Symmetry: D2
């Protein structure tokens, strides 16, 4: 029933006022007809009554309701982008003297927030290998407050054993705040809260928006953590504009059909790459043999379209240009989750530099692909032409 | 020449591409045609080359250029709202052990960020009376890193003697970061950076947007402080959407003709209130006798339309409803800076509770007015009817 | 390669300027830097140079290029909605004394334009049964200027034999303008201009927008008819706003994946209805046995999700309310082509009244369904519950 | 009280739902909760009940209410631009055999609609000098259905004696439909429907939008003519998108303070030009001695900022480039009514060619200026520098 839920989540008449989609209510000022209405709005300023634009309008409330339904949460906080959701969700739960334990495959801006901002504020960060599983218990310190997961990992796509990690954390520090950056799954292919994670964070920028033309972050928390997340993020002034909230709700309505196509196409590309003589390794959560693939198969309900692979050699700078500059359909850009296919390259030492306290286990150039909605045979031909430029 | 500058600031062909206003470029992904173009964009990712949507698109670059011209700064950082600009601009310059010195008339959410977020990060906040002037030197501690001004003050409208404050800070701690919330002046009626302030922060939500239908914060920094502001705000994921950036640029184009009307009308209302038997005090920076009026007359080039007054009595709850619930033109809402007139009330003890380490010097109910663009005689008739309901 | 074409159509650097999607250029005024540039823009004011907002901005040019590529036309005119495209495209080619020959299954507002507007301007209109095929030749008068097709027909879904109609028209009246309302096919499941039709009109409101939140009409003409269409529509001031043009281009990027789901789901529902004891007839072009199905099978490349069926009785007012008022997933609304499922009822005598010079051949209430993106088993359960309410 | 009316027109709780401005309701489909509600909406589909997006959503209804209040009409029809409003408002009231009598100073596209569209549909058009006054009676034919006014005229700015024209029409042809293109007055500086005109048409593109970034037309009709205008324009599919309707309502809120500045600055420039040795004539309705000034003074409540003047020679193309290419503040573009100043040149023989059955009474190049919101002394200096380039 996920497709039905995606079509209907948040679409109630109090928000739509007769249209199919929520109205767009643009506001800072929200008007109180009487002193008693103002008092009521104040009491309910975080409970869906119109109070002030920084808390939201009908358009935001509709999106928040949709996200809570789809991710099974008590509340959804909104942010100007994914990086803001990560940074402010972590910040909401720490004080000076605390420790954060974060996967070494976390998105680089998330790491840099920890090492360049949190550290200044008296909050330390330690690191773990994404396949650590139950052994994470040994890394929990007396002051560990937050455990931060990201599955699959950024770039290299390792999938955590979330049940093993969560069980170990709860044994040692049942009160800890467990968070996950659930962007790759779009919050719906992995139902994080059902696994005992406290907060599921997404760059709604990616698959929820789905068209590469809006930026927005979300964080859906369970009942234990919601009030602290909501109020501390509000104290940092975190919000999103009404129009982007509308566009995120709108993206939900095609998320199912889109994801099924990204899954089908990216798996086909990954299977083809795995047979290719110029490819050393394919990092796709759905491909047999990929790191944590057995946890993806057990714990996820599908795949998206982002993955990576390692070439059979380290490209020279001349080869990198010959390869990347001459694609016809794949484009070079950051971000992903849109309708179009993207390609980027990283050398192994570049990845090692963003794997704290760890090395990488490959020596070829790594290529990250986002597989969009183009015909897959056309995408395969584009990749084949690229291989011919470097063979 | 301010009106000419407001019409033209940021409106260059590289952003407008033939239209009068900037194009609206909605993006996360920004495409690099070659590896070398990507390297160039990376080196210039904070210098106006398209790199990634979190840094901005053409639409943001146009607004940033306009704000730097109008406020005389080296760079302009963008935020989802004014409160995010205040919180993240302060956060960008502090670390555990630092001290912030803030006017006791600061906007309440700014105070709450200090007491409820900064405090648990090991950053202490002290307070000063807005008329302290040169005596602020005695409050500067070895660990004072930030001095935070707001002139006129929130609600009660006291105007600082900025030249005296800045000179005192520079004598004792010249490296300190002096910031101002310059929202009431819309950043243009008081040229903060020409007075030796380091960073001018605004809720562009107010007069820059001008229509009560968008939220956005700005912070314009001098060359000394720009890199740290830019990079630390970016690590917190702070940005605004392209469409709100467009609407802020658009608001600049009528800001001069709007502010002149708000000034003319609000001063007429303030002069009338000052003669009224039911009014104890009028707090309008432009009205003779108001706190810091001589600094407003010396240091500002105009007034906006927000001010307050104190009634000759403390209204009962029944009188508050009779007064506020029955206006025909003034509405109750938070925010201000739009085309319509607004009214709110506060009891003295409510204000005292947001004047840290200080008491208030009045006992009547305080009324805050925003004077919009309606005909002033109609607004006066509405206020007169209000007075008759409580006489 | 249609999916690749849909992802990339119109997305050239001159329109996108570095983002994935076109920029949104909002304009009436377009600025000429020199008199020489103004002269060049004037000469090329219908050839893709920026001249005046009524002709379009970069955003419109990008959509027009996409529509010409996808429908194989020489030019694409834009209109405020589908009905404006129909009315103004017909008007662009008639003058007093002319005759229009239109299918009797044409959309009712299209018929009303002919009988209420054209008739008082000296232009007569005659009618044909949608399955007339080659016998249309005997209805062509010496003054027949326009032959207007709609396949499938509105409401009742009959599919024309376009090859037989076009061949008959060209034998008798080679210079006639053959037009089609190609909305049901979204202009891509039936390539009208490859069949010898001169102009393909769409309510881009439906599947191109795809989300029920924008209105826009398009008309794509061959080289023979383009100049007259363009210039006469322009004389009537026909245009669309830049933002809706952007959203139409954006809809193209998911059109393929959406249509495949609408086809799969709607055919499954039709097959179930076609064996259902409370259903007298199913009108779905893709269902064997439906009127004109053999032509759909030969001439179309797929199906959308709009179709109708006839109940085993004419519902009374109490029965119609018990049926329609209590659906859980299907909603009552006009329009279609969006992500959500819709239901409407038409009584047979109502349809007969909008079948000029013709009778209907059924007596039960007709139900028109739009099958959206919800889970099809959930939709079937909703329809089954409906049947139980009227059994 | 106009400023108060402009701030408040159309801003009722049913449309704003708690915000200051209307909600933006984007919709084709509008959902009926029950068959009973659909029946009610159908009966009232042109009477302000939500029925279908082509009729409008809450956002349109709010704008329509505002326009009817401000112009004193029974209804307001919306169109994609001003030219569509003119063409479709005329078309709504003519049939084969009718005659249209139009001022020879009408906007050129309005003339071209008459000569190129209406003529081939059996509707003839004749012409009259804008100062004809009461002598227009002699030109009214038995089949004259529409008398079309435009005051001030396009380009040359002549002001009609509307009382004299209307009285003559009513004496000879009381049932005629009298229309005016009231764009220059923004519908509010000349209350056309109080002078016995039946329909006031505007390019809301100009001063109502006020920022050069939207296009929209309006036609406000009296009770006698509303139903025919509404229903015939709807049969042509004429509508505007919800977002442009919102931006038009939003423009009303600053229209008063904008127009006062355009009046002040443009009259100052006109007075300067009227004493300048390089100027042969100044065409500004507010300038004493301009054609029809005495009617402007009697019948209008203010002036906008668009006017023209005639140079002391017909400039060559080389002089036009030297003059126009090198302005610093004035830009070349079509349209007007925005915040920036614009300049265009018209040769006398080109104007004569769009003065049907009449000649011009000047031989110098005509310069049309739009005076924006820049500082007027800067604009005067820009014009002076232009004079020096051609002296
Ligand atoms: C896994 C993951 N988490 C957060 C972000 C940041 O979201 P944004 O809206 O961009 O602030 C991303 C961003 N990725 C860019 C890239 O991978 O190229 C992310 O992938
Ligand atoms: C002086 C001042 N500074 C910051 C803000 C916050 O801006 P926002 O965009 O709302 O986050 C304000 C806000 N004012 C609301 C009120 O005064 O009622 C402000 O006044
Ligand atoms: C087949 C077909 N052709 C034109 C239109 C009109 O488009 P719009 O954008 O609404 O002006 C439609 C519209 N139909 C409404 C309905 O079927 O309920 C159409 O179906
Ligand atoms: C007086 C007058 N009436 C109608 C229009 C057309 O409006 P639009 O929204 O542009 O279709 C205009 C147009 N003017 C362009 C120009 O004068 O340069 C007009 O002036």
């Amino acid at each position: 029933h996920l497709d039905t839920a995606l079509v209907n989540a948040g679409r109630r008449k109090k928000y739509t006022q007769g249209s199919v989609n929520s109205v767009i209510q643009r506001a800072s000022s929200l008007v109180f007809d009487t002193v008693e209405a103002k008092k009521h709005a104040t009491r309910n300023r975080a409970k869906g009554e119109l109070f002030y634009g920084r808390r939201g309008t009908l358009t935001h409330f509709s999106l928040q309701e949709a996200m809570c339904e789809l991710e099974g949460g008590a509340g959804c906080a909104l942010f100007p982008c994914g990086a803001a959701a990560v940074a402010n969700t972590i910040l909401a739960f720490v004080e000076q003297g605390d420790h954060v334990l974060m996967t070494n495959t976390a998105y680089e801006p998330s790491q840099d927030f920890c090492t360049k901002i949190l550290a200044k504020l008296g909050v330390t960060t330690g690191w773990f290998d994404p396949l650590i599983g139950a052994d994470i218990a040994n890394l929990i310190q007396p002051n560990t407050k937050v455990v931060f997961l990201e599955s699959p990992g950024s770039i290299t796509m390792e999938v955590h054993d979330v049940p093993a990690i969560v069980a170990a954390v709860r044994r040692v520090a049942p009160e800890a705040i467990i968070m996950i950056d659930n962007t790759w799954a779009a919050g719906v292919l992995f139902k994080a809260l059902d696994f005992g994670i406290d907060i599921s964070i997404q760059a709604a920028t990616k698959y929820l928006i789905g068209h590469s033309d809006g930026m927005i972050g979300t964080a859906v928390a369970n009942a234990r953590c919601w009030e602290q997340l909501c109020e501390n993020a509000y104290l940092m002034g975190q919000m999103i504009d009404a129009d982007t909230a509308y566009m995120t709700s709108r993206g939900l309505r095609t998320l199912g059909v889109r994801l099924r196509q990204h899954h089908e196409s990216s798996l086909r590309v990954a299977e083809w790459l795995a047979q290719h003589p110029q490819v050393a390794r394919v990092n796709h959560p759905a491909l047999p043999g990929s790191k944590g693939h057995e946890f993806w198969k057990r714990d996820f309900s599908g795949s998206s379209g982002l993955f990576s692979f390692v070439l059979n050699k380290r490209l020279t700078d001349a080869e990198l240009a010959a390869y990347l500059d001459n694609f016809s359909l794949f484009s070079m850009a950051y971000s992903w989750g849109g309708f179009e296919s993207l390609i980027l390259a990283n050398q192994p030492e570049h990845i090692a530099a963003i794997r704290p306290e760890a090395e990488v286990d490959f020596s070829g150039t790594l290529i990250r692909l986002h597989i969009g909605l183009e015909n897959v045979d056309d995408l395969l031909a584009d990749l084949a032409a690229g291989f011919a430029r470097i063979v």
